[PDB]
């Protein structure tokens, strides 16, 4: 499912993302836009990750979710990679919260460092009333 901008902002605010680990809602919105264009069904082979990235947040199956019942999956989020491709993003938010809790924080996403860090994230929550 592809979220309209303000729709997503409200959902993430409802899910406790604004200010989480000190990351404002604007930053999460900027991340989601460049990683997936707000589409829950997005998937890409990430050269950097040497694995496939799943959904709205482009979370990897290398460390965070188990893709295809692999007995040997790290599965830090203890979720099937498919759950991160759903229309209800509660699971994807729970898992992204987990990713930012590790030593790299928001920088764990190269796209954030590349398209959002030290820039105008304000426009993404614009007019949303969030």
Positive or negative, the CA dihedral 53, 65, 4, 87 is positive
CA–CA dist 76, 96 (Å, integer)? 11
* DSSP helix/strand/coil, 23: strand
Q: How was this entry determined?
A: X-ray
Clarify whether 7 is annotated catalytic.
Answer: no
Q: How far is CA 3 from CA 51, 83, 87, in A?
A: 25, 17, 9
Q: Which of 4, 7, 18, 35 is catalytic?
A: 35
**Residues contacting 26, CB < 8 A, separation 6+:** 121, 122, 124, 125
Q: Would you tell me how many other CB atoms lie within 10 Å of the CB of residue 14?
A: 12
In the chain, the number of structural domains is 1
- Report residue 53: phi and psi, to 5°: -100, 135
Query: Could you give the CA distance from residue 103 to residue 94 in angstroms, rounded to a whole number?
Result: 17
Q: Check if the beta carbon of residue 126 is closer than 8 Å to that of residue 120.
A: no
The catalytic residue among 4, 18, 49, 53 is 53
Task: Name residues whose C-beta falls within 8 Å of residue 82's C-beta, 6 or more positions apart in sequence.
Answer: none
Lookup: tokens for 2: 């592809």
Measured CA to CA, the distance from residue 10 to residue 115 in angstroms comes to 22
Range of the domain at 118: 1-130
Domain CATH for 76:
1.10.530.10
Q: Which whole-number Å values give the CA distances from 68 to 31, 61, 76, 79, in the listed order?
A: 26, 10, 15, 11
Q: What DSSP line would sit under 37-104, residue for residue?
A: TTBTT-EEEETTTTEEEETTTTEETTTTSBSS--TT---TT-SBGGGGGSSSTHHHHHHHHHHHTSTT
Q: How many residues does the chain have?
A: 130
Is 102 a catalytic site residue? no
């Amino acid at each position: 499912k592809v979220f309209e901008r303000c729709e997503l902002a409200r959902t993430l605010k409802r899910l406790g993302m604004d200010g989480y680990r000190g990351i404002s809602l604007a930053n999460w919105m900027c991340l989601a836009k460049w990683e997936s264009g707000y589409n829950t069904r997005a998937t890409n082979y990430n050269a950097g990750d040497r694995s496939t990235d799943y959904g709205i947040f482009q979370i990897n199956s290398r460390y965070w979710c188990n893709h295809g019942k692999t007995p040997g999956a790290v599965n830090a989020c203890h979720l099937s990679c498919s759950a991160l491709l759903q229309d209800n993003i509660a699971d994807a938010v729970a898992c992204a919260k987990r990713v930012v809790r590790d030593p790299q924080g928001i920088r764990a996403w190269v796209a954030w460092r590349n398209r959002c860090q030290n820039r105008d994230v304000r426009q993404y929550v614009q007019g949303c009333g969030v």
